[PDB]
Structure formats: structure tokens, C-alpha cells
């Protein structure tokens, strides 16, 4: 999961 | 009402604009709505709970550290400030007003929490524990994260997180339903599609996209049919950015991406909840569809749908309007319970070839308890194999003629995995009558001799039964 | 009725070769792309190879690249998989299908190969  | 005296409030162009190019938050504030009584939680890498512009609104009850399993969501400090993302999001929602520090949050009298959950293995259980935290206390959850935005991933919530979403909307807020607010994605330069992201693509989340200061589609923006609405965020080098709280008790003017858009939307939703605490999770999405403005947002794909609303794959129904949200909330009658109508379309698998079209006339469960005459969300659940996934483009046309792009070509996506019962979602036929002929279009956008097979198409309609529009 | 029947499976020494066959009936065989997928003990379905309708385009999973050859004879309503340099890792039930995620009758009963 990547931060936006 | 007095406009905020905070030093950087003037640099908060998206709030303090007199250009008529803003979120129209002041109109809400002057109606007396600043977020009092509402509780918002940031699910991210932590929150600097002792930040001078957050401490005053910090709520330990809206907070937890899921990564280290303790009640304290303080970000882990490192040399390069890797864990600043949550703190920046929190200030947008609820930075304290009139305290001489930084700027102000959209809902500067709301209480703000953080769930530290990205700074560890992000397992299915970790996601579920975050989404499901204290749901009769936390009203609104803001999540600015998702599957990799590389333009070739297809991924969504696994079983526990899916369960937490459903429990949220079914049980949350005494049964009114948790409000889940999501950033639509930053994969624009990889031509990513936010329908390949099962969090944004969920009917349970309000997926929010971005617009630049001058009303353009930002470079990082992903287009898809599941996006509901837009808030301002960062753009090119000539355009201003978001002003918020930063790690180590600082102030930044350089907060960027759809991660800045989702929290501004959560703050506007908090104002809206204060104006009508009885709103259900579906009420909130109705208010967004009814009040969001296309005006002054530039896109190449604005289309009018079946009930006369302008819709874009870049912006959904357009820019959130805080004043209009709150004004309508005050007099809003709650909508009838959600109905769900499922229609299996295929009797035989279909070769895809250069272009495949599947047409089916549906009654939308006429004569049954799940009869729908007024659509909310629609899903096409597809199972297909193809030799190069990214060369597919997929459209869905409603009986009233509204064409949703379920999937645009993704040039980086060379996967051979196809789609396995993947639910593509569109918001673009909201309030239409769904009875009549639907058309699914699948096409090979490449010159190459690509090939494959559609083995399942399930049309899923959500909505209510009501009068004629 | 629609039927896909797999054959040619069996025991083989590692480093050996097998040729699998899949006969099709009940539908126009040339109307569909075709797939070989395999399920190994205690493991999920794995796509192995694929071919378009006339046989002019073919694809292979990375794990079988350079060892397997998929082909079809449309007149004879049959799909083949020629397997070479078989490894222990290749032991599975091997299925014939018109789609990777197809279920019976559009996926076959399978044929066991053992290395
Ligand atoms: C919310 O419900 C209460 C309980 O009946 C009612 O008194 C109140 O007027 C409602 N609020 C709105 C926004 O109508
Ligand atoms: C909407 O509700 C507000 C708050 O009670 C009220 O003052 C206003 O008159 C209402 N508008 C109507 C009924 O048109
Ligand atoms: Ca901690
Ligand atoms: Ca402040
Ligand atoms: Ca994405
Ligand atoms: Na959503």
C-alpha cells in the first residue's frame, strides 16, 4: 500500500 | 463569524479565495458550521498529536496505533521525515483556528484522530482494524493510500477489510453508517485507472479526485468512472499548493497529490454532518452528487448523463461546494434503504477479438423486493482472460445512453492475468432509471493480434424505487 | 453437449517429454482462444500457455518459457501442449479451457502428469  | 486570523490562512487559496475559485467553505462557516461535535480519523502513517496546530483538536478516542498495537499514533521519527503523510492530512481537516499558528482546517472545530497503520506490514487484518476502529465514536474516516499507482496493478481489499467496510456502513454511527473518504490515486503519469483500485472503486467509499489551482486536470490524476467528486490540490510549478501541518511541529505550503484532496473532502463532509447528524452513508453521497459543480473545471470528457448532470471521468460530478452541501443537508429527507439487483448476463463465454459487444435488456428486478427505478451505483463484475491486459478498453452504456468508461487502456499493464470477477464501478448513471438495454463494450485498442475470452459478466444495480424524474 | 477432454498425461522421468491433447466437441472449436492451466497439489490455479483462434499468436508463463509448445488443429478439433525438459515442479493436473477462469463445461476434467 502506497501513500498518496 | 469572523474569518480566521492565522498567519497562513491567506495562503490557503482553496479556502480563502475571493476569485470564486475555491471550495466555498466560508459560506458554510458563516452559516455557523465549523465541525463542532464531529470526529474524523486519518488512517495513515501516524499523527503528530502534539503539533501546535493539532493538539487543541486531538482526540485520543479517534486514534490507535495498529502497527505497534498501542493507543498512541505518534509518527516514528526518521532522518528524511518519511512518516509525515498523516500529519499533513490531519491539518487539512482540523488544524486549529485563530491561534496564530500556520493555517486552519476545513472543520477547525472538529476533533481529529489518527490511526497509525502504514508504518508496518499492511496486512488484511491491519486494514480491517483501522477501518473498523471505534465506529460509534469516529464519524468519518479519511484514507490517502492504496494499491501501487504504477499503472499495472489490480488490487483491492481482501476479506477482513471488505468485512470491515460492510460492518462500517451497516453498523457504524448507530446504524447510519461510517463515512469512508478515499484519495482516487496518483498514477496519472503512468496512465493508471482508478477502477483498478478496489478501495476507490468500492461503493462504500467516496472517492475524491483533484483539480489544480487554474482548474486543470493535475499531472498525477487518474481517470475512472468510480470517482464521485473533486477538491482542489497541487498542480504545475506555476500553481499554488496545499498549506498544512508538518512533522516536527512545522508548517508546509507544499502538500501535494490526491492525498491532499481526500482530507479537504473529509472536512467538508464533517461540516455537512454537523448541519444534519441524521444523514446516512448513502445520504452523504447523494448530497455530493446533487451539489457538486462542474463550473470552471477544465476537462476533455464532460458529458451530460440521463438526468441532465454533467459528469467527467477526471472529476466525477465536479468540485465540492461546502456552502451548498451544508445548505441542502439542513432540509434533506433520508433516502430509502439500499436495494441490490443482480443480473447474470452470459449464457456462453464470448471471444473478445477486436471488439466485443454484449447487450442485455433488463427489468431491474421488476415485481420483486429489490426492484430499482432510481439507480445509485452500478457494477459490472467481469471475468476475462486476455494476452495483454493493458490493451483493453471497457465501456458500459446505460439504457438512458450514459457511456461509462469502466477501463481505459493502461500502456504499462502487460499482465497476462486478465480479470477474475473484478467489479468495475460507475457513479455516472446516478438517479437514472436502470430498466432497459445495457451494453458492455470490450475492445482491443492495439494493432497487435491480441486475443482472449470473456467468461462472466454480472451486472449489479444499487438503488431505490421511487417516482419518475 | 459442450465437452473438453484432456489426454496424454502420465508418469515421466524428469528431463522427459510429454505431449498433451485436448479434444473439443459440442461447439465451434475455432470460435475460441484456448488455454492450458494447471493445478498442483495444495496450490492455486496457474496459467501455463495460450493460443488465439487460428494459432498465429501464442503466449507462455515465464516458468515454462522455452520448454513448452502450444498448438492447435482446427480441422481435427484438438489442442496440444508439447512439454520438454519436464521438472518436478511441473507435476499437476493439467486443464484445457476456452478461458483462464472458465469452469465446466468450458473447462475440462483434466489429465494428470507426474514427474
Ligand atoms: C434529525 O433527527 C431528529 C430526531 O427526530 C430531528 O429532531 C432533527 O430535526 C433531524 N435533523 C435534521 C437535519 O432534520
Ligand atoms: C432548512 O432547515 C433550516 C434549519 O432548520 C431552516 O432554517 C430552513 O428554513 C429550512 N429550509 C426550508 C424548509 O426550505
Ligand atoms: Ca505507538
Ligand atoms: Ca492555526
Ligand atoms: Ca491507482
Ligand atoms: Na468509492
Numbering used by the authors:
A (entry chain G): 2 to 5
B (entry chain A): 110 to 578
C (entry chain C): 1 to 115
From the paper:
Furin1 belongs to the family of the calcium-dependent proprotein convertases (PCs). The classical PCs cleave after basic residue motifs, with furin preferentially recognising the motif R-X-K/R-R↓ (where “↓” represents the scissile peptide bond).
We have crystallised the ternary complex of human furin with decanoyl-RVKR-chloromethylketone (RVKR-CMK) and the inhibitory camelid antibody Nb14. The interaction interface at the P-domain is located distant to the active site cleft of the protease, involving amino acids Pro458-Asp460, Thr492-Asn496, Ala525-Asn529 and Asn558-Thr564 of furin. The complementary region at the surface of Nb14 involves the amino acid segments Tyr32-Tyr35, Trp47-Arg53, Ser56-Asp59, Val98-Ala102 as well as Trp106. Furin is found in its catalytically active state forming a typical covalent complex with the chloromethylketone compound that is very similar to non-covalently inhibited human furin15 and covalently inhibited mouse furin4. Analysing the complex between furin and Nb14, we found that the shortest distance observed between Nb14 (Asp62, side chain carboxylate) and the decanoylamide-C9 of the inhibitor measures approx. 19 Å. In addition, the catalytic cleft and the active site of furin are clearly not blocked by the binding of Nb14, and its inactivity towards the cleavage of small peptidic substrates is perfectly conceivable.
